[PDB]
């Protein structure tokens, strides 16, 4: 009944999607051909005779990444019309994504979404997977959001976005893409879950004992977090928190819609036996800065809201106890205008693990979504990066050549300045 439509944009979005749909299949006992020898139904539609199809769209502006899906292990899982490719990519250029190349497929993408949505009886909303840095992930995504807002409007929209790192850069133009897409998508997105590749790599090396983590591993990890978010919809639970609830809980002001995601426990096979894993113990692990999936320091920020989603062999009293002790903890400060900081979800189903996966199978897990003033730092960094290049007009000609106007750059920048100030203002404590 409570359908969820997933949209995977560009390489990051598609590859993450691969990992997510792989996991979903394992969790619901769906084979790679769509068959199984009732809960699945929020993510899989049902056709004809014992075949089940993901409620998803995969889009990329070049064919290579999606071609892998078509030719791969899960070729029979997706219907061909839900795998959409253009001919030429956005070449790390927001303008090409948003205008020049994106405007050629946007109608198509939306048409297919409409068809998907027409077979839903109780649409909860959308999960949009992309990156900040790519021309498609940045430019196309903003365009897509705009259209979605027009055709649906009041349906919860969620973005799992690979926020660029401080040190671990990939392209040179990442800051431009990040800034523009944030500016253009801001008024159209309800909640966005930031993730940082550096942090996940670190986690993999320290907590999973993995010498050389691959993008695959990162994707797998992300899939777990996503699964925890939607488990309350896909399974039965003692206390349930849904997609709408998150936005209500975690967003105190419309602009401040960027909670950070944390998962626990992420351990190896050897480290499963020598460690007990109570609810308090994993919650504490989550709430400690070293296990965070964005390269930021909460000790230097303030918490505005926490949502804790527990899963498996979990007891509500125990969670309450755990939270109580965390409340006392001096190193965790919450904003002074918020006496109530926790939304808590508890679900019966343990996290299911992919055969041959890097994570050990545990009786209890937890996914925290927490909104923090520490994000301000990242924004400041990004703005600084933008300023350095823009002062010289470095790369600007490309954007203008693809139909962007220079004034829009300055506009994006000023909007981000305003955003930065908004965070700062929120930070300070109540007078009188």
């Amino acid at each position: 009944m409570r359908e969820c439509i997933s949209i995977h944009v560009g390489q990051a979005g598609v590859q993450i999607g691969n990992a997510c749909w792989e996991l979903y299949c394992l969790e619901h006992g769906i084979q790679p051909d769509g068959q199984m020898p009732d809960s699945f139904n929020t993510f899989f539609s049902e056709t004809g005779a014992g075949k089940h199809v993901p409620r998803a769209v995969f889009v990329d502006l070049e064919p290579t990444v999606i071609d892998e899906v078509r030719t791969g292990t899960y070729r029979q899982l997706f219907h061909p019309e839900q795998l959409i490719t253009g001919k030429e990519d956005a070449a790390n250029n927001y303008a090409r994504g948003h205008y020049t190349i994106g405007k050629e497929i946007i109608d198509l993408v939306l048409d297919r979404i409409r068809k998907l949505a027409d077979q839903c009886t109780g649409l909860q909303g959308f999960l949009v997977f992309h990156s900040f840095g790519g021309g498609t992930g940045s430019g196309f995504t903003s365009l897509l959001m705009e259209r979605l807002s027009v055709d649906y409007g009041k349906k919860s929209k969620l973005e799992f976005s690979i926020y660029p790192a401080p040190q671990v850069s990939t392209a040179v133009v990442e800051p431009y893409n990040s800034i523009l897409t944030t500016h253009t998508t801001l008024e159209h997105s309800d909640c966005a879950f930031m993730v940082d590749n550096e942090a996940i790599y670190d986690i993999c090396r320290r907590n999973l004992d993995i010498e050389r983590p691959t993008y695959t591993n990162l994707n797998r990890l992300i899939s777990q977090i996503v699964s925890s978010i939607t488990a309350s919809l896909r399974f039965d639970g003692a206390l349930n928190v849904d997609l709408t609830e998150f936005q209500t809980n975690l967003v105190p002001y419309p602009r401040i819609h960027f909670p950070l995601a944390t998962y626990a426990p992420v351990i190896s096979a050897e480290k499963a036996y020598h460690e007990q894993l109570s609810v308090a113990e994993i919650t504490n692990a989550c709430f400690e800065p070293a296990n965070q999936m964005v390269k930021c320091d909460p000790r230097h920020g303030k918490y505005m809201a926490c949502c804790l989603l527990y899963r498996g062999d979990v007891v509500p009293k125990d969670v309450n106890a755990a939270i109580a002790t965390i409340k006392t903890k001096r190193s965790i400060q919450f904003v002074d205008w918020c006496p109530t900081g926790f939304k808590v979800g508890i679900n019966y189903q343990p996290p299911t693990v992919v055969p041959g996966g890097d994570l050990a199978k545990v009786q209890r897990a937890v996914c925290m979504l927490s909104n923090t003033t520490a994000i301000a730092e990242a924004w400041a960094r990004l703005d600084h990066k933008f300023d350095l290049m823009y002062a010289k007009r470095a790369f600007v000609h490309w954007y203008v050549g693809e139909g962007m106007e220079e004034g829009e750059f300055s506009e994006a920048r000023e909007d981000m300045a305003a955003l930065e100030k908004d965070y700062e203002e929120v930070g300070v404590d109540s007078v009188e």
């Binding site: 409570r2 205008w337 918020c338 808590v344 109540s430």
Partner: protein, 429 residues
């Protein structure tokens, strides 16, 4: 003869409600299919208060199940006892309320309320002599809080001369279960003060304490907590459902426990709650029960009665026992703890006694206390509300649904006034 209409709203409301129903059917010898397999004619004599008799010797709860979400309903349906309910009495939406009072009261809830009301009216019209309505829900979510208040408003308007009582799960001191729970509770309270006859303040924190400290349950489950609540609920209607020496009902209790209309917020209690090892060493007789009942550790509201005064207290005893003894016990507590009872209501302890004990036991006791200490809870909520509202935190979630700041403000004001009222009578000589 004396029909009650039962309503369950939201996840909490429905999970507690199911347990309650299970308890009641067990009491009356009804199995999961609705057939009577009891032993005594006493179990069928007053079956009609909670069950309608259908064709082919089956019994069905006079129960309405309501939610904006379809999952919990489905779970209930799939549970043991899920099949006892009338399928047409499940009224569920598709959207949910997203922990937003506005959505429950004005938007999603609004679009569903008429459908509920239609069923409710039908149920009322089936019954010969409607005693009234009991609503089980939380104040902290969106449906129980917003939708629940709406339901209360409408039902009250329709049936102003029948009793409207609620079993309300109130947000707790230590943990915050949600972010916007203060808003949801505050709004709810504003309606409840105007439109209910009596409100049973159940707090999960207190329940946890009881389970861990008194029941010696290292690992309580929500089910266990729900069970306690259900037992307490059963306690209140036992004198209406069975022969007794001194017989109470819902109206009489209200009359005794409510000296002024607005001050109708009870702290309920149950005795005897005991551990498995600790059962055989103590003799469960009236004195033990009495000792258990009148103390802070056994109250299901997060407030110490020793921080205020008891305005009125109703004790309802079940089992074969000496009335004289009971009265003596009641006298003793009043006399020795004189300073904990407000002095302008003489003999502020009321008694009821029903001959039918609960299952497995020789006797039990159920407690309804109206204490001025509950004001502390209200104050906490007010403070929490203010802290958030002064910075307009989360406000656009509610204003987006058509709500204005004025409504919030009024709600706050009303809450404050109630607290002041409570204080005044606490202090009066």
């Amino acid at each position: 003869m004396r029909e009650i209409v039962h309503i369950q709203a939201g996840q909490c409301g429905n999970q507690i409600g199911a347990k309650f129903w299970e308890v009641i059917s067990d009491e009356h010898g009804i199995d999961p299919t609705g057939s009577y397999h009891g032993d005594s004619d006493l179990q069928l004599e007053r079956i009609n208060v909670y069950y309608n008799e259908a064709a082919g010797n089956k019994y069905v709860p006079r129960a309405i199940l309501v939610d904006l979400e379809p999952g919990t309903m489905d779970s209930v349906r799939s549970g043991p006892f899920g099949q006892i309910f009338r399928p047409d009495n499940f009224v569920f939406g598709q959207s949910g309320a997203g922990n937003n009072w506005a959505k429950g009261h004005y938007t999603e809830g609004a679009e569903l309320v008429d459908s509920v009301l239609d069923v409710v009216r039908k149920e009322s019209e089936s019954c010969d002599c409607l005693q009234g309505f009991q609503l089980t829900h939380s104040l902290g979510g969106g449906t129980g809080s917003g939708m629940g208040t709406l339901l209360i408003s409408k039902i009250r308007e329709e049936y102003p001369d029948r009793i409207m009582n609620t079993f309300s799960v109130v947000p707790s001191p230590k943990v915050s279960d949600t972010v916007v729970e203060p808003y949801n509770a505050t709004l709810s309270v504003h309606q409840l003060v105007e439109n209910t006859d009596e409100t049973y303040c159940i707090d999960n924190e207190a329940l946890y304490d009881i389970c861990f400290r008194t029941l010696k349950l290292t690992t309580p489950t929500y089910g266990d907590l729900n069970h306690l609540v259900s037992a307490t609920m059963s306690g209140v209607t036992t004198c209406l459902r069975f022969p007794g020496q001194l017989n109470a009902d819902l109206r009489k209790l209200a009359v005794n426990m409510v000296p002024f209309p607005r001050l109708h917020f009870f702290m309920p209690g149950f005795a005897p709650l005991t551990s498995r090892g600790s059962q055989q060493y103590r003799a469960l007789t009236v004195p033990e029960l009495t000792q258990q009942m009148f103390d802070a550790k056994n109250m299901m509201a997060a407030c110490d009665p020793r921080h205020g005064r008891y305005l009125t207290v109703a004790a309802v005893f079940r089992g074969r026992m000496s009335m004289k003894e009971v009265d003596e016990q009641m006298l003793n507590v009043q006399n020795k703890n004189s300073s904990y009872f407000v002095e302008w209501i003489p003999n502020n302890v009321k008694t009821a006694v029903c001959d039918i004990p609960p299952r497995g036991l020789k006797m039990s006791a159920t407690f309804i206390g109206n204490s001025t200490a509950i004001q502390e809870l209200f104050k906490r909520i007010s403070e929490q509300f203010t802290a958030m509202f002064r910075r307009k935190a989360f406000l656009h979630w509610y204003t987006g649904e058509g709500m204005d700041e004025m409504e919030f403000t009024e709600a706050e004001s009303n809450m404050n006034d109630l607290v002041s009222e409570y204080q005044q009578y606490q202090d009066a000589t």
